[PDB]
Amino acid sequence: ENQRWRERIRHFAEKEIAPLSTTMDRTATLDAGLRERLFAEGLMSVEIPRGYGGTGGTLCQLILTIEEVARVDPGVAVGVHVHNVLVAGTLLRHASGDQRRQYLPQLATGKIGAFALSEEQAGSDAFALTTVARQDEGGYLLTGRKRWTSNARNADLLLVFALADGGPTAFVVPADAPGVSLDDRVEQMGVRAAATSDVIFDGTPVRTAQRVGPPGGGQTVALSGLGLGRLGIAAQMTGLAQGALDAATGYSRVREQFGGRIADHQGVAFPLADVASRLAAARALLYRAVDLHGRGTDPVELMRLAAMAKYVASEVAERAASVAVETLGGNGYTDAYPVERFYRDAKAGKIYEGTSNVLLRTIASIMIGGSPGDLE
């Protein structure tokens, strides 16, 4: 069943995504035809139940979706990850019956979800927010600025975190609500198909019915998806590494210098074998961490395994992309091949859903006792 699912996403990514990747990366756009296909074929609703217009599939199927998309286009995979894992997944866990019936069919059919937590001064210290939802009759008036919102220029629904007068609180806010605007602000090095924007709120009206969970319950809402967010990026990094390794292996069989294929030199072959070995271990850890979901496994152990999976997969993605650029020589430094894009894309995996240091802080803290804040 999961072999058939893998093959279906692989075929989709190779036929529908690959021919558009170079242009989506240069222009930082999501192709309109591809967007219609992502929704139609179920890549935007993998775990959303059938009763809300979703695929009704498993965490395993969602992880395989992100992996096989990422194998061809890590940038498209960011949008798929944010939408399914962070936005639809948060509503499946925390939204009321009414909120699920209102938003899940939209996310399953045609409305893209983006996740707006970070700010200029709230990065690793993610809840040092200055965006405020001020009380009003019937709900709130939202004012502030979010930074690094992936897929913002393509999004219809924002899951936004703001101080309720009261502590961090989660809201669902339409991207076209009064007082909402975007500032693309900067060029980013990779995952450009889902490039970030700043999101600006200028007294945007939000009804009480848009609040997800209680006032000051924003950190609990975010924390429930932390582990799953890290597995989704571990899957994106595993797929990226596979795509890099597939390009380098195939090239090494056909490029000839000095009268024979470059694969016949141990200086070319050995780095590929080393990457392949590390990638088999990264994938085994990812699928182990996924398998231990829905088993009543200790939550701390799940947090540990998700942080370790993302840390290891990120490392292997960097190594794979690096080795792949070098295996291809000058061609590997160009857009004629995908490996320079994979190299630019891989670096985003060390920054979002927990920087390397934030992951190691968490992991060490579980192993030696104390909290992450005790480690200097």
Q: List the one residue out of 239, 356, 327 whose CA is nearest residue 287.
A: 239
Instruction: Tell me whether residue 118 or residue 210 sits nearer to ligand FAD (CB atom).
Output: 118
Tell me which of its own copies, ligand FAD, none is bound by residue 84, counting a contact when its beta carbon lies within the kind-specific cut-off of 5 to 8 angstroms: none
Q: Is residue 223 a contact point for its own copies (CB under 8 A)?
A: no
Backbone phi, psi, residue 28, to 5°: 55, 50
Say if residues 156 and 202 touch (Cβ distance below 8 Å).
no
Q: Is residue 265 a contact point for ligand FAD (CB under 6 A)?
A: yes
Q: Is residue 124 a contact point for its own copies (CB under 8 A)?
A: yes
Q: Which of 47, 318, 340, 353 is catalytic?
A: 353
Structure tokens at 172: 């669902």
β-bridge pairing 113-116 and 157-164: parallel
The alpha carbon torsion through 305, 311, 317, 318 (nearest 10 deg) reads: -170
Separation of alpha carbons 314 and 308, rounded Å: 10
Q: Is residue 26 a contact point for its own copies (CB under 8 A)?
A: yes
Instruction: Tell me whether residue 193 or residue 286 sits nearer to ligand FAD (CB atom).
Output: 193
- State whether the Cα torsion 111-171-196-132 is positive or negative: positive
CB of 55 vs its own copies, minimal distance in Å: 32
- State whether the Cα torsion 17-18-19-20 is positive or negative: positive
User: Which residues, other chains included, contact 280 with Cβ-Cβ below 8 Å and sequence gap of 6+?
Assistant: none
Instruction: Tell me whether residue 2 or residue 27 sits nearer to ligand FAD (CB atom).
Output: 27
Q: Is residue 220 a contact point for ligand FAD (CB under 6 A)?
A: no
CB of 243 vs its own copies, minimal distance in Å: 16
Residue 178: HSE in the Cβ half-sphere, 13 Å Cα cutoff: 7
Q: Is residue 130 a contact point for ligand FAD (CB under 6 A)?
A: no
Separation of alpha carbons 109 and 117, rounded Å: 24
CB of 30 vs its own copies, minimal distance in Å: 19
Instruction: Tell me whether residue 45 or residue 150 sits nearer to ligand FAD (CB atom).
Output: 150
Q: Is residue 267 a contact point for its own copies (CB under 8 A)?
A: yes
Separation of alpha carbons 71 and 245, rounded Å: 10
By CB under 6 A, what part of segment 354-373 binds ligand FAD? 355, 357-358, 361
Stretch that binds its own copies, among 52-60, 152-160, 280-288, 326-334 (CB under 8 A): 326-334
Angle at 51 between CA 212 and CA 108, to 5 degrees: 65
Instruction: Tell me whether residue 41 or residue 156 sits nearer to ligand FAD (CB atom).
Output: 156
Tell me which of its own copies, ligand FAD, none is bound by residue 117, counting a contact when its beta carbon lies within the kind-specific cut-off of 5 to 8 angstroms: ligand FAD
Q: List the one residue out of 298, 340, 334, 342 whose CA is nearest residue 317.
A: 342
Show the site string, 268-307: x = touches its own copies by CB under 8 A, - = not.
x---------------------------------------
Q: Is residue 127 a contact point for ligand FAD (CB under 6 A)?
A: no
Look up 353 and say whether it is catalytic.
yes
Say if residues 359 and 88 touch (Cβ distance below 8 Å).
no
CB of 46 vs its own copies, minimal distance in Å: 27
By CB under 6 A, what part of segment 34-93 binds ligand FAD? 82
Q: Is residue 191 a contact point for ligand FAD (CB under 6 A)?
A: yes
Separation of alpha carbons 85 and 44, rounded Å: 10
Number of residues this chain uses to bind its own copies (CB under 8 A): 51
Tell me which of its own copies, ligand FAD, none is bound by residue 202, counting a contact when its beta carbon lies within the kind-specific cut-off of 5 to 8 angstroms: none
Q: List the one residue out of 289, 280, 287 whose CA is nearest residue 308.
A: 289
Q: Which residue is associated with the tokens 């967007």? A: 35
Backbone phi, psi, residue 171, to 5°: -130, 150
Q: Is residue 354 a contact point for its own copies (CB under 8 A)?
A: no
Tell me which of ligand FAD, its own copies, none is bound by residue 115, counting a contact when its beta carbon lies within the kind-specific cut-off of 5 to 8 angstroms: ligand FAD
Query: Which residues would be at the binding site for ligand FAD (CB under 6 A)?
Result: 82, 115-118, 123-124, 148-150, 188, 191, 196, 255, 257-258, 262, 265, 267-268, 326-327, 329-330, 333, 348, 351-352, 355, 357-358, 361
Give the active site residues. 353
